[PDB]
Symmetry: C3
């Protein structure tokens, strides 16, 4: 009786741009002039095909490389396989997804479903080190039929020391009301390992971050080590068993949190108030 994903299998078309931003960053967007860091969420159902008409509006070569989804070598997004895009150029990248199922040999083919991500592979170096650092990364979600759908999805990227390329002490913060079903996509990039920690909430360390029932032995956690290009996701009920509050999330590596890269999960009562949080003190 929660909302759930339907069966997939449609062909989808989408336009994407890589742009240099006024402050020197680089971002992806669905419209020229509306690039963001992280780039926009792409969400499909297992079985869907996605044709991305990608335009590089920058003055250097750029590409689009995706984790997890099915792509032929011509949509690798690498210079080696001649899959990047010249300045001002356009290229159609195709990502496919499949449902799980029994193979002819009796084995089980896993589906595409999961929390994934896309990023540049040619800016700065042949592994996209400069593009990733500048902001060319974004999330991808592939739903299995029957997966629970959230009220809202927030993307948190640990990129080197930053969260979502933001300066220390600037969040990002996310807001919810007690009881909302909130989804988090958690991606890591760059040079360092991290440990993602969330106060007041916990999730299962498995594909969906949710336990299906009493037979799932997955660890329930509130702290998870991650490294460059790791992605996972989960859903929580905001404030469940703990109430409204300004619930911190941050990397738990002590020098990293001490740098001031922290955010708040601001869980409100219906009247918008948050116990112990005065907005004028923030």
């Amino acid at each position: 009786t929660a909302r759930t994903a339907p069966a997939g299998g449609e062909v989808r078309h989408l336009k994407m741009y890589a742009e240099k931003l006024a402050d020197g960053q680089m971002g992806y967007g669905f419209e020229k002039g509306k690039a963001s860091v992280p780039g926009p969420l792409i969400e499909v159902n297992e079985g869907d095909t996605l044709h991305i008409e990608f335009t590089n509006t920058m003055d250097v070569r750029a590409s689009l490389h995706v984790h997890g989804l099915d792509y032929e070598i011509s949509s690798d997004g690498t210079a080696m396989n001649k899959s990047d895009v010249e300045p001002g150029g356009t290229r159609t990248y195709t990502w496919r997804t499949h449902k799980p199922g029994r193979r002819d040999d009796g084995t089980w083919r896993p589906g595409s479903a999961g929390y994934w991500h896309y990023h540049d592979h040619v800016v700065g170096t042949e592994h996209g080190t400069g593009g990733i650092r500048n902001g060319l990364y974004g999330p991808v979600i592939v739903r299995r039929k029957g997966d629970v759908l959230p009220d809202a999805t927030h993307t948190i990227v640990f990129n080197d020391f930053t969260i979502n390329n933001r300066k220390p002490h600037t969040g990002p913060d996310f807001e919810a009301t007690v009881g909302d079903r909130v989804e988090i996509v958690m991606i890591t990039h760059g040079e360092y390992y991290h440990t993602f920690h969330m106060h007041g909430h916990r999730w299962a360390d498995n594909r969906t971050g949710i336990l299906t029932g009493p037979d799932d032995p997955s660890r329930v956690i509130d702290n998870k080590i991650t490294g460059p290009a790791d992605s996972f996701g989960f859903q929580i009920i905001a404030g469940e068993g703990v109430g409204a509050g300004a619930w911190m999330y941050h990397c738990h590596v002590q020098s990293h949190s001490d740098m001031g890269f922290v955010g708040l999960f601001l869980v409100k009562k219906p009247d918008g108030t948050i116990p112990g949080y005065e907005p004028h003190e923030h």
Copy 2:
């Protein structure tokens, strides 16, 4: 026919102190003058509520922050939410736990059960870097009804380069007799990633460290990467299939083990002897 945890649901009261130790460390204890590093184990059943009458006997502010368990924002243990404790002060922290169960929307709420930990959040920095470094950390276990109970529980904390804040070449060692059911709570703190390795024994990488039966596909391991504020636990049968012996455990990062931070799991025959281990050579 092994002992198992009963159904929870009782209200428990406990006193805790933070104290400066004569050697400059800081520790938690259940009694004044009996602080330890790591702090004392707290063990409850899912459904229990714990009211901790906490007294800060130090000359600087200190707090108590817990992973995993349910707490309202007023027991956050952070300065931001005005949840720390002035020098000489007292505060009651409340931790709650819940059993798993079906929500009204048909989804499955995960329970509190697991291997968790508590630590300071305000000594030295606003993330407790100095308190953690000085020794203000300890383990928490939440049992699910029917969980197997051990003969004994040992806590191993990788804190920066140390084990349990001890100097190189000083253990800690733990002792058992062949056949004992031994539980390990494994916590990591500080700045570095580690890989916990145990000779002669292995466990399952899931919630309890134990496989329930033949249908659990979890990896069976003897080596596990960890990062700051990670916690996991497991149970082993001492010497099972391998016999008595001085079984090393250590971080497998080569420069870390080469520093001499290592311990021994001393598994004895009934007569107390250990093959290949002469106590006078140690």
Copy 3:
């Protein structure tokens, strides 16, 4: 109808040598003069016993230490337990394995099955830092009855910055034809954490890297953080859903991949061609 492992339980005998190589490395082999880095794969069935007649042909002490399998303390491979081997010496190491099963107390004993590894424990330091760095490491696979068997098994070791001790830009590459069932054993050694990434393919994060059916909630991944002495393995169908191609694998830590330690999974059509791969350009 894929090939599967039979029930184990045989006693096996094998000879192994540690040798200094002409270029200054050190390797294990099954025959004098045929040491390799990584050392040769050892593969057994749960229940098998392996007696290894090990000869150290080097001028320094060396040993053989294994993860995961059952060994008594006399086959620890450590100097502390007098289990290493003098220059020119010989020693028989015994590794045992067991099937999973119900204990007398009603609990479930996990079997030995998994992806494991062996390495030196005394060259350079008392934890084998020099031996490991020089190349004394190799893979071990223990099969459970009914496990799916591959067409071929490839071993990938992240040893400090190198792959299999090879220089940057020298692979190693592995070849397959579209449709082959390919097994990867992935081991990490040394000082650093890594993230193993494979283009165009994905696997399950569980014991076998394969989902048994629709009830397994394990995350499906193409990127995995690892640390020193971690081991895991998986099987993929070469080119499944993605076609022939030169599919990169590499560490995704950006400075590591930028050093040029990368390899190719060269997936061919039957005529041996690879789209977008010209052999003369490589």
